[PDB]
Write a protein of this length. Structure first.
Length: 105
DNA sequence: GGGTATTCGCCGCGTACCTCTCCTAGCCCGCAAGTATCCTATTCCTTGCAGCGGT
């Protein structure tokens, strides 16, 4: 498994695309339609910034990954994930959240 | 969502020794060597100007 992939909890395909400069990823993406870490195609990024030339940041590549990682709190995420793992559901999400919590702790 | 099947990709496949060969490709710029050419002489001829005896 890829430690980045499941620490940040993003499918490895999308990090593969981002880290070789063929897409865009939002960093904070607040005060707008976008979420924390949506992926964008080049044209999608151009269109989004056109309609939303406000301050939402969407970077491209290693710098974006670094900012996204450095912009996270570990133990708080651990609390949220253990609360969610409390139940709903112990079928495969049980295994997934146990692994992610193991890495985070 | 969720239990399940199917696919993709990574990991692995004996020890010790002996002999031999071969180990980047391509451009480029100084540079040695070798050469064809150009200026350098000699001999003949017919002019153009300065001295010069002569009166």
């Amino acid at each position: 498994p890829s430690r980045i992939g499941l620490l940040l909890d993003m499918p490895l395909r999308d990090i593969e695309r981002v880290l070789y400069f063929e897409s865009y990823v939002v960093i904070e993406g607040g005060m707008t339609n976008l979420e924390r870490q949506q992926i964008l195609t080049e044209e999608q990024y151009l269109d989004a910034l056109e309609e939303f030339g406000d301050e939402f940041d969407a970077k491209m590549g290693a710098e974006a990954i670094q900012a996204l990682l450095k912009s996270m709190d570990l133990e708080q995420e651990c609390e949220q994930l253990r609360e969610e793992l409390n139940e709903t559901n112990s079928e495969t999400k049980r295994k997934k959240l146990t692994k992610r919590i193991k890495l985070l702790e």
